Ligand binder design. Structure first.
Ligand SMILES: *[C@@H]1O[C@H](CO)[C@@H](O)[C@H](O)[C@H]1NC(C)=O
Ligand SMILES: *[C@@H]1O[C@H](CO)[C@@H](O)[C@H](O)[C@H]1NC(C)=O
Lengths: 104, 143, 104, 133
C-alpha cells in the first residue's frame, strides 16, 4: 500500500557483524515500504522536487521515474563494539533505526 | 572475557536504567599492556609500572578519563623519556575498607596525549602506609 | 548502472504549473536513477541503515528491500510566481533541482 | 506580470554578481485608478514572522517636493517627503519601510495613501522586500 514504516529485525550474526559488535545481538531497524504516487501526502514530508518528479511521472511515465519510499529520519542505538582492537561503547550510534518514512 | 566486564557493565547499566546516560557519547577502554612487571615493595611503599596504547582522534572533545586500579595515599606518575622525568598526574587518597576498584582523574594527561601523537605511555603507581588488570577509560564526544 | 544523476527538464506548462509560475517557463530539475547494491560506495553517502538494509538483502532477499537511489541534496532556483494572487519573487525557491544523489 | 518584477527576475538571472537584499520580494498593486489629479490604495498582507527588510513606493512623474501621507479616519501621518528632480524624471522610489512594518502588525490589511505635488500602464505599485525565518 502507501509508504509506511514496516517492522524489520536485524540479527548481527546473519550479516556477519557479530565479529566486531559485542552487544547487542540485534535490534529492530525497521524499513520503509510502499509507493509514492501523486499526490504525495504531507505526512511524508515530500520535497518540492519529489512532488514535481511524481507529477511528471503521472502524465508521462517514461519521462521520469517515480518518487521512492525511503527513511527520512534515523535514530541511534547503544552499541558496544571493537574499534581497531579497542573496546568502544557509543550510547548513540547514529543512523541505525528508522523513525519516519517519506517520499523523496 | 575479551570485553572487559566494566564495559559490559556500562552497557547493561544504561540499557536497563534509561534514566541516565554517559557523560560523553564515546567510551573507550585501554587495557594495560605490562603484564610481566612485579611491584617493588619496601616496607611502607609499593610501586609498579603500567603501559597503555592510547589513541584518541584529534577531532574529539575528551570529557573525562579515569584510571581504574586495584589510610593509604596513592600518587600516579608519568615517566617521560639518568635523565628520566616523572610527572605527577594525580595525588589522591583512598579508604581502606573493601574499596575494591578505585578511580583516579587523569583527564589532563589524556588531553595532553590527544594533542600529541598517538603513542604508548608508561605510568607508575606509588602507594604509602589477569582479570584484575588495571584499565584506562576515556570519555569523549564527537564534535 | 550505479546510482547517479541523470538529466531531466521540466516545462511548467506540461505539468500545468504555468498558471501560477510567471518565470521561468521551465528548468532542469534532474533526477536520480540507478541501483544500490551492496557494497554502497562512499560517494553515494550511504547511511548506516542503508548499508545494513542493502547487506541483509544481499544475503537474504525477501527479508528486506534494497536501498533506494534518491536525491540527497537539493538546490534552489529563482522563481517569479503568484502566491495567493500577489506577484512574488523568490531568488532561492528551495528544493527544485538535484545536486547530489545517494542510497538511502 | 509587472515589468518591474519581470525585470527583477531577468536582472538576477543574468547578473550573477549580485543578489537581492531579501529572499522574498512582493509587489502590491494600486486599485484606485479611477481618479485624476491623487490618492492610492493598497491591499497589503505580509506574514508576521517575516522580517521586512525594506519597502519602496514606486511613483511615475511626467525640481519640486513630494509628500506622502497615510489617510486615517484628517489626522494625516507623514511617511516620507523629499525634493525630487524634474530633469525628465520617470520613476521615483521612496522608502516607506516603517509604514509597512506596523502594517505587518495586524490591522486592516487595506491601506490608503495620498500623494501631493507642489507648485497608461504606469499605475504606481508598492514593493516589499522581506526575509523568511
Ligand atoms: C599498539 O601500538 C603499536 C605501536 O607501539 C601499534 O603498531 C599498534 O597498532 C597498537 N595496537 C593496535 C591494536 O593498533
Ligand atoms: C483585498 O483585501 C480584502 C480584505 O479587505 C481581501 O478579502 C481580498 O481577498 C483582497 N484582494 C485579493 C485579490 O486577495
Amino acid at each position: 500500500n502507501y509508504c509506511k514504516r514496516t517492522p524489520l529485525y536485524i540479527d548481527f550474526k546473519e550479516i556477519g557483524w557479530d565479529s566486531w559488535i559485542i552487544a547487542p545481538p540485534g535490534y529492530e531497524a525497521y524499513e520503509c515500504r510502499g509507493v509514492c504516487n501523486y499526490p504525495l501526502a504531507e505526512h511524508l514530508t515530500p520535497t518540492k522536487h519529489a512532488i514535481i518528479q511524481a507529477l511528471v511521472h503521472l502524465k508521462n511515465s517514461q519521462k521520469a521515474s517515480k518518487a521512492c519510499c525511503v527513511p527520512t529520519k534515523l535514530e541511534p542505538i547503544s552499541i558496544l563494539y571493537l574499534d581497531k582492537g579497542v573496546v568502544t561503547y557509543k550510547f548513540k550510534y547514529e543512523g541505525m533505526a528508522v523513525s519516519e518514512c517519506g517520499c523523496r | 572475557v575479551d570485553p572487559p566486564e566494566y564495559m559490559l557493565e556500562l552497557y547493561n547499566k544504561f540499557a536497563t536504567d534509561r534514566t541516565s546516560m554517559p557523560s560523553a557519547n564515546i567510551i573507550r577502554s585501554f587495557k594495560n599492556e605490562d603484564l610481566f612487571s612485579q611491584p617493588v615493595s619496601f616496607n611502607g611503599l609499593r610501586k609498579y609500572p603500567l603501559l597503555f596504547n592510547v589513541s584518541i582522534p584529534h577531532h574529539e572533545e575528551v570529557i573525562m578519563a579515569e584510571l581504574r586500579l586495584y589510610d593509604r595515599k596513592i600518587t600516579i606518575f608519568e615517566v617521560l623519556e639518568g635523565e628520566r622525568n616523572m610527572l605527577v598526574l594525580v595525588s589522591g587518597e583512598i579508604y581502606g575498607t573493601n574499596s575494591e576498584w578505585e578511580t583516579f582523574d587523569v583527564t589532563d594527561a589524556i588531553r595532553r596525549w590527544q594533542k600529541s601523537g598517538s603513542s604508548t605511555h608508561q605510568l607508575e603507581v606509588h602507594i604509602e602506609s589477569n582479570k584484575h588488570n588495571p584499565l584506562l577509560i576515556v570519555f569523549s564526544d564527537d564534535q
